[PDB]
């Protein structure tokens, strides 16, 4: 439900995001690459009980270390 807070409208998977009220998606906090855009950095995917759609914050890419020396 775009541009809507979850306090009012669903009464009229409950979770509140910057893009709106999202129903049906399980929220994890391990970042991945974006699969289905949602908005404001939130991306969702279907990720295999409980083979459900998950919602996560998009990851910009793997980090790279590089030694230092003059």
């Amino acid at each position: 439900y775009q541009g809507v807070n979850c306090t009012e409208v669903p009464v009229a998977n409950v979770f509140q995001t910057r893009a709106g009220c999202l129903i049906g998606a399980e929220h994890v906090n391990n970042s991945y690459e974006c699969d289905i855009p949602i908005g404001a950095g939130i991306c969702a995917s279907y990720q295999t009980a409980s083979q459900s759609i998950i919602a996560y914050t998009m990851s910009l890419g793997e980090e790279n270390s590089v030694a230092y020396s003059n």
Binding site: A40, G41, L60, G61, N64, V66, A67, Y68, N70
Partner: protein, 414 residues
């Protein structure tokens, strides 16, 4: 028989601004047209699939905006951390590198540009947030800048090593026809000029917010268009009233439906005009975004030989900075200065032979003749190593007598 050759140079840093994206807007057709009136909604059913087309066009524009943003910024496979050592060849990148909480007294150009740009629930309209937040844009920019600074020419398919900055600068100097022995002799002055230019740019940006007119115009035009569309709701278009309830209450259906039809036609025209103009503007902004992506690829990740594509002078390197709905580039360029006058000849007449320089031009100090590069005065004695030999002294116009030396004979005699 005269030629001018530089004896000095300066390092110049300039600025360029390009818009990238636009605001994403979605509109409810029925809410704007009728506004919770059942008779109007029933009458609107006779027009087929207008609202569908309008919504589809707006949705396509909204998608294209994020497409443009990801085309421009998402060019980097990996994330490069800022090296915890700031010991470069005397160059301080503090004002352009980030700071996790930004607690330093030195503000990044990002904050200055952001503040310079900075300085409804009842309508049928909606505005959507972009897919990428500002923090992710800043992260992409910082990673790209740090990777360019650290890995040098091994940025792509890179390794776990850091090419020293002075070597990169020397290679870039070689790129434009100046030998690196020039850089290795006044690196200190080079760094001082670079730092002074960066400071001047920061002060100039902090002076005024009027330099961002290109980015301001997009916002102004979009707001003007939206305000015009909203204000168009109050017109009568020849009907009795601009409020549906007044028409319903004051008249019977057999004329109220005609008045409502008139109002419907007017508001449909308004919506069509707005959407067409938005489509054209979206095309323009896509062209601008393509230009921005090309410039990033061809000037930030490498050195360009195209004249005046990356500012005036000879291109050395450039750095990107993020901005609201746009990007900012900082081009570093080489500019020759303090010219001098000399006498030149096309070739040198030795004993029956004509000698041409392998590189550079022949110059005369009034007494002695030398060969030097065309962008920095550095004379050398005319050796048979430096001179390409072909032909005789007959056909070349303006050839001049002189003596060509040979290191071999004194070595042989000893």
């Amino acid at each position: 028989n005269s030629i001018a050759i530089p004896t000095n140079f300066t390092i110049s840093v300039t600025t360029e601004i390009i818009p990238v994206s636009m605001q994403k807007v979605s509109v409810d057709c029925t809410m704007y047209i009728c506004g919770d009136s059942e008779e109007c909604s029933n009458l609107l059913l006779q027009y087929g699939s207008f609202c569908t087309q309008l919504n589809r066009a707006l949705h396509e524009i909204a998608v294209e905006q994020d497409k443009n943003t990801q085309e421009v910024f998402a060019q980097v496979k990996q994330i490069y951390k800022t090296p915890p050592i700031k010991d470069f060849g005397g160059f301080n990148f503090s004002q352009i590198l980030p700071d996790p909480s930004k607690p330093s007294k030195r503000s990044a150009i990002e904050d200055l540009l952001f503040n310079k740009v900075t300085l409804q629930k009842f309508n049928g309209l909606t505005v959507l947030p972009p897919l990428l937040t500002d923090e992710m844009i800043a992260a992409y920019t910082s990673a790209l800048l740090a990777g360019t600074i650290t890995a040098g020419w091994t940025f792509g398919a890179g390794a776990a090593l850091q090419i020293p900055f002075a070597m990169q600068m020397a290679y870039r100097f070689n790129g434009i026809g100046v030998t690196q022995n020039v850089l290795y002799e006044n690196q200190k002055l080079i760094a001082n000029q670079f730092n002074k230019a960066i400071g001047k740019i920061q002060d100039g940006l902090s002076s005024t917010a009027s330099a961002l007119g290109k980015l301001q115009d997009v916002v102004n035009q979009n707001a003007q268009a939206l305000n015009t569309l909203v204000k168009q709701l109050s017109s009568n278009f020849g009907a009795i009233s601009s409020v549906l309830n007044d028409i319903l209450s004051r008249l019977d259906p057999p004329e109220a439906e005609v008045q409502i039809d008139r109002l419907i036609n007017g508001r449909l025209q308004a919506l069509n005009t707005y959407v067409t103009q938005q489509l054209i503007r979206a095309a323009e902004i896509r062209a601008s975004a393509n230009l921005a992506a090309e410039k990033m690829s061809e000037c930030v990740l490498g050195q360009s030989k195209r004249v005046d594509f990356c500012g005036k002078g000879y291109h050395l390197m450039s750095f990107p900075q993020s901005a609201p709905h746009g990007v900012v580039f900082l081009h570093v360029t080489y500019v020759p200065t303090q010219y001098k006058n000399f006498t030149t000849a096309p070739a040198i007449c030795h004993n029956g032979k004509a000698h041409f320089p392998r590189e550079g031009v022949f110059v005369s100090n009034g007494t002695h003749w030398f060969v030097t590069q065309r962008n920095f005065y550095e004379p050398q004695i005319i050796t048979t190593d430096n001179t390409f030999v072909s032909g005789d002294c007959d056909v070349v116009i303006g050839i001049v007598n002189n003596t060509v030396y040979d290191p071999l004979q004194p070595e042989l005699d000893s």
